[PDB]
Design a protein around this ligand. Structure first.
Ligand SMILES: CCCCCCCCCCCCCCCCCC(=O)OC[C@H](COP(=O)([O-])OCC(O)COP(=O)([O-])OC[C@@H](COC(=O)CCCCCCCCCCCCCCCCC)OC(=O)CCCCCCCCCCCCCCCCC)OC(=O)CCCCCCCCCCCCCCCCC
Ligand SMILES: CCCCCCCCCCCCCCCCCC(=O)OC[C@H](COP(=O)([O-])OCC(O)COP(=O)([O-])OC[C@@H](COC(=O)CCCCCCCCCCCCCCCCC)OC(=O)CCCCCCCCCCCCCCCCC)OC(=O)CCCCCCCCCCCCCCCCC
Ligand SMILES: CCCCCCCCCCCCCCCCCC(=O)OC[C@H](COP(=O)([O-])OCC(O)COP(=O)([O-])OC[C@@H](COC(=O)CCCCCCCCCCCCCCCCC)OC(=O)CCCCCCCCCCCCCCCCC)OC(=O)CCCCCCCCCCCCCCCCC
Ligand SMILES: CCCCCCCCCCCCCCCCCC(=O)OC[C@H](COP(=O)([O-])OCC(O)COP(=O)([O-])OC[C@@H](COC(=O)CCCCCCCCCCCCCCCCC)OC(=O)CCCCCCCCCCCCCCCCC)OC(=O)CCCCCCCCCCCCCCCCC
Ligand SMILES: CCCCCCCCCCCCCCCCCC(=O)OC[C@H](COP(=O)([O-])OCC(O)COP(=O)([O-])OC[C@@H](COC(=O)CCCCCCCCCCCCCCCCC)OC(=O)CCCCCCCCCCCCCCCCC)OC(=O)CCCCCCCCCCCCCCCCC
Ligand SMILES: CCCCCCCCCCCCCCCCCC(=O)OC[C@H](COP(=O)([O-])OCC[N+](C)(C)C)OC(=O)CCCCCCCCCCCCCCCCC
Ligand SMILES: CCCCCCCCCCCCCCCCCC(=O)OC[C@H](COP(=O)([O-])OCC[N+](C)(C)C)OC(=O)CCCCCCCCCCCCCCCCC
Ligand code: FES
Ligand code: FES
Lengths: 89, 383, 53, 100, 125, 220, 53, 383
């Protein structure tokens, strides 16, 4: 269970060389699912002493329809106002 | 001189990369968030300033117990005679939940007495439309009524009357003086108010903070939200009101807290004072009191460059230069790049542009070899 | 000219910043808690038509 | 009259001066853009312009980019990097070949 | 890079002739500009990095302007007042016309165009 | 103030990078122009970074779909460890485009597509409008649907520049021939065609004045 | 209010003027020959449109 | 730090009430007004800066004698090679009027070589029209030609050649570099120049100064005017040029003197330098030299309120108060007015408004009797 490749590969104790001593290979220890990065952008930039990872998160993914409708009310009111202005013009 | 100290600040730990379990701060503190103690050594006076949202029985009984214990020389309450009469007539109510049923009845304290002249009628129309719009933007529930005094102030007044202590009424949030100031202010219109209210949240930070505060209010409830009300949250609400209506916010907050400070400082009967006021006025009153008394907490000056590890940066640069020189001398060549660690901001990896630290003016420039392996001796030391 | 040109104001600003106690001074609040901070004059008139933000 | 220095890489040769200039320009731009958020907040080298959860504000970052480019007489490549903190601003300024 | 030679610029190597007339470019006050010396820059008069990829001792000229405005930046890369034009492109063109093969090329193009002119003149007969 | 319309300067070079842009900046006020420029940059970069976040999420979650779309691997391997879902780039969409190496091919394709769309609109869709005898205005509707197809400019336009191929005497002979051929009044093609009642621009040998004939139909 | 109102900026200016070494500081030249005078930043841009006098 | 000292100042004795025979200054000083001596101790260098209007035989021979006596290590002259050739060809002339007879021939030094491209032709047109307009505004005669180098510079160059001293030519007032700067500057038009030049004299002070300077020029002549030229007059002329065309004034004066200072400070061969320059460039060069050398004359800080007799004012007020109290006590009445001396700015002599210094807050205010005779005892002393 790792999020970062450097942390995952820094110290591996379940490598084939060590596992062959016991000759047991559990299915739950697949390298395919062993590590997986987050879904947010993360890029390295040169820091004072070494590369540092900066995360770029722009928008959330858990908004709900009540909030969206509350944010959209002004757009609907503006549409109605402009249409009424055209009709009265 | 002017003691221009931070006030109405809502940004918590701007120097910390908070997230997950590493929070910026704890907003939950029912007693400290609304209890403040101020001292005036010159006159030997003590003030217990309480910021009440009028929607917490816990805080109401805490204030009652504090008044009973302290036995103040005088009590100041931000209410009016009409509301006091209504509250005293109301009897046998001990919980804010029950008291909230009387909010509409107690809302009659907002007399807003004015004549029906032409100018006053136009002002009434504009003011009521703007009040409806601002209440729409507030979107507070019935449980949370910060501007309607309730159980806490009722208990304070009752205890003062029982102990025969002078009681000074400061008026509601919108009293006669505030209404006169609003009338003097001409910039008030429902349409412009709607425009500015829906244009105020101009940043994702502001939108997220607004959503967080209001979702917390809805989920937790009026009483729990009042208990968890924090200084930073109150400052954020003050700034949100500023953005919604700076001209009205000025009168309703800055001038109101200045008047309250005047009342509590210049015309206070006794030495011990217990003041109960709307919470968002506490920051301004506290700042004014501290500035007048010259009792501000001593804060050490912060150097804007004090948190930069210039030593670490220079040491890293020196180490990288030494490593490059050593590698170049070992390999009988020169460095491919002068970047300590590769980064993709400059497209040096796949473009002709390079990063080489070799600059000199003429053939006799002593700094000609700086950045090159020729600047180091056989022992890998600078020459 | 052969030397990169810098304004005299920029050179003076650099010389001031060379000081170890430098801090921005054109602020309406003593954010840096400097004991020698002096409240700058507020550039707002009676009309206060520029207070909206 | 003060003659400007003949050497070019003054900003790189004086990291402290560059950091102080970045702090000053960022503070001025932030106070002009969003006074209610940065009027009472000191700006230091470790200060970051992200929310408590780590999310960044593109408008604020672009305002900082404009302030930095106007101050240093350079052109920041927005698509390549985003300035979410004074550390990133310092990194970009030092990376730029010819800032003044 | 090299600084601005005050009218005493001699390119280290022979640069590519990017053009035969200058660029009227608006320069900002106090902004550092890296004029291209080799002459193959893809970013215009300013350095693009191709000097690092082409075999040449010509390095970009890093200069600054104390007053913003329009300047004629040299494109022939032979101006002694580089990065500023000094009408050396006219002398370059004149030498090209003076050369035997350059004279032939210029007048061959001229006579090719004169062919169109003569066709237009004699279109009606 | 001054006669320097084409030399107006600006305090900051990015507030108008051309002469006309600087003139507009001067006219509108540099403060408002700078504010508008900053706001436009903010909008563009907000959109760009939202798109980049979406692309990064797509690449990390569904690498095959990202490769199909042509998105570059959005993760950075500066730390030195290669990613576990890298793939070769499929750049056909972004290379066979009007903005890329296939610009000329896609220009030809766009021209052919527009021509085919016009051909469809004129010839294919209208063919299905009428498929049975019509009680009312059958001929009118048939001619309505046929006019758009039979009067296309490709085979109608050109007589206005007939001198490019018709010599003076040949021009007069072809003028009389065309008048005879298009004499039929019921001809929308003749209606849309350029008139034959004109003289050769270079030189005319037969007709001295246009409209001075001995027969309303014959040009001579 | 019964007391004549003066702004905090005005009160601070009066307090500073009470000092015996007070002198105007928003000047481009050290007209008063004060050893502690610091050249204020010039509010002129590259276009220099406002220089005309 | 920036040495922001006074420069281009032309106001003489603003603190004196001058008039009649009490003048503000003495403009006539043939030698001091044009001879300046500067020293750089760090480099051990001496500079003799001369401001020449090129229209004074007295100053020409004075400069010749000064060069002969000093034997400078190097000489700088604000002229060009073409003018030097013309002057050396012109021989056997010892009179400034005789040389002025050649002024048209010497005007050929303004080669202003440029190509005839479309842009350069538009420039040439605008520049020559503006030059005609600015010459019209100058309205100088043939006798006074400050921008045409003459006998003084000719003698300086000839003596330098005789003594085998390096000679550095700085170009005419409008040389190649100045013309390039003017071309870069787009704000140049004859019509706008006429408008601004006839709208420049916006004050009676400016109009009177212009009239005085030009009437003096007309009455005295070129040579006498050059001899009487003063630093204040030169500063006034510089400011007048600024008002006429500030954009062109920048290039003509400030940039030119900065370049001259660069030449005289950075690329001067010897330790002793004799510089001959247009007079109006002397102030800027001197200011830059002093600022760079840190050799400004030590001035004493002047208090803005140091010349106010506050003691005298307070003593007069006290004396008037005592006299009023004494008179009131003698007459068994109160003062009619509190004005020390009657003045008609306030119409108190014939209107109801009075001037009485009696103010107090309440019946128990100790300042109730201040300003009244009741505040003094029988001995005429305050109580
Ligand atoms: C029928 C007509 C009438 C009826 C209409 C309908 C009904 C009426 C109402 C309609 C409107 C409702 C509005 C509701 C409120 C707003 C939304 C809200 O609150 O939601 C909360 C929610 C949470 O936000 P938050 O986290 O709180 O804060 C957001 C931040 O502020 C940061 O966010 P932001 O604010 O910067 O927002 C970003 C926005 C910024 O917009 C702007 O441009 C700036 C804002 C507007 C500025 C003003 C505009 C101009 C104003 C007028 C000026 C003219 C002059 C006026 C003069 C007046 C005076 C005269 O830019 C975008 O739209 C970006 C698009 C997304 C990236 C595009 C990716 C394309 C490629 C596909 C990649 C992925 C593929 C996946 C796999 C499939 C394919 C293989 O908002 C968002 O989700 C914001 C981000 C939106 C973009 C991402 C999500 C979109 C889908 C992405 C997946 C891929 C598909 C992309 C499709 C689009 C392609 C272009
Ligand atoms: C002309 C033919 C008819 C049709 C047209 C009518 C006229 C045009 C109307 C156009 C609509 C816009 C009106 C704008 C002005 C609005 C002013 C306002 O709202 O302030 C109210 C003003 C403010 O009072 P408050 O703040 O509520 O405090 C009341 C307390 O009692 C505290 O009071 P207090 O006891 O302390 O003492 C103060 C009180 C003391 O007052 C009293 O209580 C006096 C009681 C009676 C004894 C004294 C009688 C003396 C009256 C002599 C009138 C001379 C003729 C002038 C004719 C001019 C027009 C041709 O005085 C006031 O407070 C000011 C009262 C000012 C008059 C209010 C009526 C305004 C409309 C009439 C026209 C005047 C406006 C300009 C028109 C021209 C330009 C458009 O007073 C009232 O509340 C008035 C209440 C009575 C309303 C009805 C008015 C009388 C009926 C006749 C007019 C309507 C026609 C009816 C018959 C035909 C069917 C429609
Ligand atoms: C309500 C309104 C409705 C309007 C509807 C539409 C109107 C009609 C359509 C108009 C289409 C406009 C096309 C041009 C776009 C210009 C883009 C632009 O403004 O970018 C800003 C661009 C850069 O802006 P910036 O960064 O601020 O830089 C400003 C600097 O000043 C930059 O200065 P610089 O010195 O550094 O560089 C400028 C210039 C400097 O160099 C040049 O001057 C280039 C050309 C000469 C070079 C060689 C000089 C040596 C001697 C040559 C001797 C032979 C010359 C004659 C050749 C044979 C006879 C033709 O260099 C060039 O531009 C190089 C171009 C070389 C190719 C030109 C060949 C043209 C052939 C056609 C001639 C037609 C003549 C017709 C009859 C004319 C008399 C009645 O500046 C310019 O382009 C400046 C000129 C702007 C012209 C505006 C448009 C005027 C109308 C042009 C019509 C062209 C003919 C008709 C075309 C077909 C459709 C009608
Ligand atoms: C009904 C038939 C009409 C036919 C005409 C065409 C259609 C109508 C056009 C209407 C035009 C309206 C006026 C526009 C100009 C407004 C003022 C202005 O700024 O221009 C003046 C012009 C502006 O100079 P500047 O902008 O400082 O020069 C550039 C800098 O030096 C900085 O230099 P840089 O190296 O940094 O370069 C910057 C570069 C950066 O910008 C660029 O890249 C520029 C690209 C575009 C260049 C212009 C393209 C052409 C289209 C614009 C209109 C001019 C057309 C000229 C040719 C017409 C041919 C038929 O721009 C340039 O290189 C600019 C070069 C072009 C100079 C302007 C030439 C035109 C002067 C105005 C008079 C035109 C009269 C036409 C006939 C009118 C008949 C009623 O200054 C003058 O030369 C002042 C005098 C102008 C002439 C009047 C005085 C004549 C002598 C007195 C005679 C007695 C009085 C008679 C009555 C009055 C007769 C007019
Ligand atoms: C003929 C074909 C068409 C024309 C072709 C082209 C022209 C050919 C002839 C001319 C060729 C030579 C061109 C000029 C070369 C350069 C000459 C030169 O050296 O002059 C520069 C001159 C040197 O003289 P200076 O040393 O002062 O000695 C004064 C002496 O008086 C000695 O004075 P000066 O003898 O040296 O006088 C100089 C004067 C020599 O040139 C001339 O005298 C001009 C000759 C040609 C024109 C003659 C016109 C005659 C008019 C009356 C006759 C009847 C006319 C009837 C017309 C009817 C139809 C309208 O220079 C100019 O003015 C040149 C103008 C050239 C353009 C001519 C066209 C102008 C058209 C204007 C039209 C009207 C305005 C626009 C429209 C308005 C209405 C809408 O000044 C400068 O060096 C200026 C330096 C820049 C800064 C100046 C700052 C001034 C303000 C501060 C003053 C205080 C200073 C500090 C205190 C004192 C010191 C410490
Ligand atoms: C009834 C009977 C009537 C008989 C009448 C017969 C009339 C014959 C008239 C002949 C005139 C020829 C003039 C040549 C002048 C050359 C000057 C010179 O040396 O150049 C120095 C100058 C200076 O040049 P430069 O010095 O910069 O470089 C050239 C120098 N060389 C050549 C040494 C390398 O040249 C020029 O600037 C150009 C001059 C004109 C060149 C003309 C070339 C014509 C080529 C024709 C090719 C064949 C087709 C001919 C027919 C069609 C023509 C359209
Ligand atoms: C971004 C710039 C936009 C510029 C504006 C123009 C382009 C707009 C977008 C493309 C569509 C253009 C359609 C034009 C014709 C519409 C009407 C029509 O089809 O009938 C007229 C004609 C047909 O005329 P007709 O013969 O049917 O005549 C009708 C009238 N009677 C019956 C009386 C004779 O259309 C054609 O002939 C089409 C021929 C095919 C090629 C058309 C090329 C158009 C020009 C080049 C466009 C390039 C766009 C590039 C975009 C991407 C790069 C920027
Ligand atoms: S100099 Fe031409 S690319 Fe660098
Ligand atoms: S382009 Fe004019 S000299 Fe090189």
């Amino acid at each position: 269970m790792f999020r970062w490749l450097f942390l995952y590969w820094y110290n591996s104790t379940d490598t084939p060389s060590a596992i062959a001593k016991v000759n047991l290979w559990s299915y739950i220890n697949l390298r395919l699912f062993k590590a997986r990065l987050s879904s947010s952008i993360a890029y390295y930039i040169l820091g004072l002493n070494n590369l540092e990872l900066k995360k770029l998160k722009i928008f959330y993914k858990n908004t709900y329809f009540d909030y969206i409708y509350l944010k959209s009310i002004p757009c609907l009111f503006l549409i109605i106002f402009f249409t009424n202005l055209y009709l009265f013009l | 001189m002017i003691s221009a100290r931070a006030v109405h600040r809502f940004l918590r730990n701007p120097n910390l990369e908070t997230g997950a379990a590493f929070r910026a701060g704890t907003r939950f503190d029912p007693f400290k968030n609304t209890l403040t103690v101020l001292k005036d050594p010159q006159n030997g006076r003590t003030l217990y300033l309480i910021g009440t949202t009028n929607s917490s029985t816990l805080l109401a009984n805490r204030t009652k117990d504090l008044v009973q214990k302290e036995k103040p020389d005088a009590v100041f309450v931000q209410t009016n005679k009409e509301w006091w009469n209504l509250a005293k007539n109301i009897q046998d109510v001990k919980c804010q939940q029950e008291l909230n049923r009387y909010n509409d009845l107690l809302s009659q304290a907002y007399t807003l007495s004015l004549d029906n002249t032409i100018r006053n009628l136009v002002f009434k129309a504009k003011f009521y439309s703007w009040l409806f719009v601002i209440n729409w933007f507030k979107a507070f529930p019935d449980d949370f009524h910060p501007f309607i005094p309730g159980l806490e102030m009722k208990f304070a007044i009752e205890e003062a009357n029982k102990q025969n202590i002078p009681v000074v009424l400061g008026g509601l949030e919108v009293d006669d003086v505030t209404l006169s100031a609003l009338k003097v202010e001409p910039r008030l219109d429902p349409f412009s108010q709607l425009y500015y209210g829906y244009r105020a949240l101009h940043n994702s930070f502001w939108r997220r903070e607004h959503f967080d505060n209001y979702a917390t209010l809805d989920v937790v409830g009026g009483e729990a939200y009042a208990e968890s009300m924090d200084r930073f949250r109150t400052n954020w609400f003050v700034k949100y009101f500023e953005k919604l209506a700076p001209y009205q916010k000025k009168i309703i907050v800055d001038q109101k807290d200045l008047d309250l400070f005047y009342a509590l400082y210049r015309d206070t009967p006794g030495k011990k004072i217990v003041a109960v006021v709307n919470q968002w006025h506490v920051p301004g009153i506290e700042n004014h009191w501290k500035s007048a008394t010259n009792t501000h907490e001593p804060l050490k000056a912060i150097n804007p460059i004090g948190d930069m590890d210039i030593n670490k940066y220079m040491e890293s640069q020196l180490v990288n230069d030494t490593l490059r020189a050593f590698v170049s001398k070992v390999g009988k060549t020169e460095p491919a790049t002068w970047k300590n660690y590769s980064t993709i901001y400059h497209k040096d990896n796949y473009e002709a542009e390079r990063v080489r630290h070799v600059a000199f003016v003429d053939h006799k420039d002593p700094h000609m070899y700086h950045g090159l392996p020729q600047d180091y001796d056989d022992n890998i030391k600078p020459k | 000219r052969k030397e990169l040109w810098r304004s005299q104001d920029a050179l003076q600003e650099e010389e001031l910043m060379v000081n170890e106690n430098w801090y921005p001074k054109n602020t309406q609040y003593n954010i840096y808690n400097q004991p020698d901070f002096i409240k700058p004059k507020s550039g707002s008139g009676a009309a206060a038509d520029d207070i909206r933000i | 009259y003060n003659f400007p220095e003949y050497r070019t890489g003054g900003v790189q040769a004086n990291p402290g001066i560059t950091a102080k200039r970045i702090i000053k320009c960022i503070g001025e731009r932030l106070r002009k853009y969003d006074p209610a958020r940065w009027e009472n907040v000191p700006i230091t080298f470790k200060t970051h312009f992200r929310d408590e959860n780590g999310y960044s504000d593109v408008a604020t970052s672009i305002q900082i980019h404009d302030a930095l480019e106007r101050e240093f007489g350079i052109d920041i490549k927005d698509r390549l990097a985003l300035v979410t903190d004074v550390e990133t601003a310092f990194y970009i300024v030092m990376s730029h070949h010819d800032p003044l | 890079s090299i600084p601005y030679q005050e009218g005493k610029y001699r390119p280290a190597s022979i640069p590519m002739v990017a053009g035969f007339f200058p660029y009227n470019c608006y320069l900002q006050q106090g902004k550092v500009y890296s004029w291209c010396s080799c002459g193959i820059s893809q970013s215009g008069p300013w350095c693009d990095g191709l000097c690092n990829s082409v075999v040449t001792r010509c390095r970009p000229v890093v200069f600054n302007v104390s007053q913003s405005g329009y300047y004629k930046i040299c494109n022939c890369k032979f101006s002694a007042n580089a990065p500023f034009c000094n009408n050396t492109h006219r002398k370059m063109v004149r030498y090209h016309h003076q050369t035997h093969r350059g004279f032939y090329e210029i007048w061959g193009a001229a006579l090719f165009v004169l062919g169109w002119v003569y066709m237009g003149f004699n279109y009606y007969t | 103030m001054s006669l320097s319309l084409f030399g107006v300067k600006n305090n900051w070079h990015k507030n108008g990078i051309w002469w006309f842009s600087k003139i507009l900046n001067k006219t509108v006020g540099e403060e408002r122009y700078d504010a508008l420029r900053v706001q436009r940059r903010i909008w563009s970069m907000r959109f760009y970074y939202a798109r980049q976040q979406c692309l990064y999420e797509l690449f990390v979650d569904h690498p095959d779909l990202a490769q199909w779309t042509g998105t570059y691997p959005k993760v950075d391997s500066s730390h030195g460890f290669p990613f576990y879902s890298t793939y070769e780039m499929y750049r056909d969409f972004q290379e066979n485009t009007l903005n890329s190496d296939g610009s000329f091919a896609q220009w030809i394709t766009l021209v052919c597509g527009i021509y085919v769309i016009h051909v469809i609109y004129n010839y294919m869709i209208p063919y299905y409008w009428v498929s049975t005898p019509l009680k009312n205005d059958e001929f009118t509707r048939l001619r309505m649907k046929d006019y758009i197809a039979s009067t296309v400019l490709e085979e109608v336009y050109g007589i206005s520049y007939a001198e490019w191929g018709w010599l003076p005497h040949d021009f007069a002979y072809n003028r009389m021939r065309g008048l005879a051929g298009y004499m039929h009044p019921d001809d929308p093609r003749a209606m849309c065609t350029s008139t034959f009642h004109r003289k050769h621009k270079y030189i005319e040998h037969e007709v001295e004045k246009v409209g001075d004939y001995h027969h309303m139909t014959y040009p001579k």
